[PDB]
Design a protein around this ligand. Sequence first.
Ligand code: HEM
Ligand SMILES: CCCCCCCN1CCC[C@H]1C(=O)N[C@@H](Cc1ccccc1)C(=O)O
Ligand SMILES: C=Cc1ccccc1
Length: 455
Amino acid sequence: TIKEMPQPKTFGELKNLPLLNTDKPVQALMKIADELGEIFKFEAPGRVTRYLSSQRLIKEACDESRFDKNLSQALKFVRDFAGDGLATSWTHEKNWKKAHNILLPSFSQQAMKGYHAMMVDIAVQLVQKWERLNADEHIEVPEDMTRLTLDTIGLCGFNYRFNSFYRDQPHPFITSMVRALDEAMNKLQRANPDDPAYDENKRQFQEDIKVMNDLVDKIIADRKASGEQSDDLLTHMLNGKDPETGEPLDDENIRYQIITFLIAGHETTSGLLSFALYFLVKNPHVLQKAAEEAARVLVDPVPSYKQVKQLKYVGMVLNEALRLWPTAPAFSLYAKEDTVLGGEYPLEKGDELMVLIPQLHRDKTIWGDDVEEFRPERFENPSAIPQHAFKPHGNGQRACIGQQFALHEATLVLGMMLKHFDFEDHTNYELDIKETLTLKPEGFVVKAKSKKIPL
Ligand code: HEM
Ligand SMILES: CCCCCCCN1CCC[C@H]1C(=O)N[C@@H](Cc1ccccc1)C(=O)O
Ligand SMILES: C=Cc1ccccc1
């Protein structure tokens, strides 16, 4: 029953590459999937991959005995500054499992309890900023969510204060990082990346890479000279020993991990919080239900770890926002051996797949006809969701190591926003999704009305 899979329009020797010559490539690929269906071939000079959009096929792709994590071109470009950090290493590189073993305890329950007070520190700064706005000023939502999540990973993970709420402009790090990500996206469609037309891109790229590495220097310097006794992510990087190899991380890999966690540890969580607030102001009945939970649970001026764990509906709200707009919108796999996908598509060892997560999460055979609706109650019973239908944090041993960090932070912060403010979509905002490999609303603004509840 071997089927021929469709393929979108080609451009001679450039094959499908020019389809990525857009500022919204993921959304363009979603439109192609809409037209071609659950699987389509995508070619570029010297490369082939297959975009998967159905749970039927993705549940097979998530079989770790058959498929391993692949570095997409995007991750290969990010590797130019993230090296063999956790997110851009191959599973078979020694430094992947070594750093995984060393850093997994930094995301245990007991670790999350230790981060909680510092996430409250940053969350309170956010609430205080909004309490201090004048009448009919508004909130720049992704901007402030990025302030919050960057500051949280800086403080919680590295005892470093980016002090983003003391800046009306993005931190130097954010500016360079967003620019490096821009360059990585745009480089995806460059057919001649060594054409001298991109000499300045190359120079600017190196400049943004040095900005990010300079902050890494300072984080490392302050820690090793500090006289305070810390027990955080950086402590584990500098002191942890891998049970298997017996070795700690070396200095080069530590630097890559700091870069990795500063980027991965904030950018996707700011997108999640932005999309979540978007859906809440567009769905006031949902906002009300989550606000009622927040008021009933968050009975103290400062939320506790235990209280955040009881914000179960807020948790469902976040999962439903990750369903509709997963902020790291794709991951890539390669076939470990010859194998046949879905009884219809034979693959040879080494063949690559692209999992298009926003399209998977719109599979009507899984979610029903109301798939575009925002209904957190979809997540009331994880046993009623088929396997691998919901993959916002990737798959298997290469799934997101920061999943609990992100969800604790976002649950805490959204709980506090709903406790302390009513929100108004005063511009009737039209969703506009900016792509920087990751996804985030652009230009989303709201007004908050304080409930005047003291901190
Ligand atoms: C809602 C927020 C987040 C989302 C949606 C998300 C999503 C993902 C996805 C889909 C992957 C797999 C990438 C692949 O297969 O190529 C991943 C990997 C990873 N994420 Fe996240 N992430 C989030 C937050 C975080 C945070 C806060 C951190 C750090 C604290 C983090 C650290 C990582 C790391 C290190 C990896 C690589 C894991 C490994 O392969 O060992 N993420 N994330
Ligand atoms: C935080 C998430 C980072 C990883 C997700 C990046 C996901 N890409 C972000 C932009 C679009 C999307 C993607 O489909 N990329 C492919 C593009 C590609 C396919 C075939 C040949 C050449 C290039 C890739 O990078 O290989
Ligand atoms: C998980 C990898 C990643 C890569 C770039 C930005 C955010 C996350």
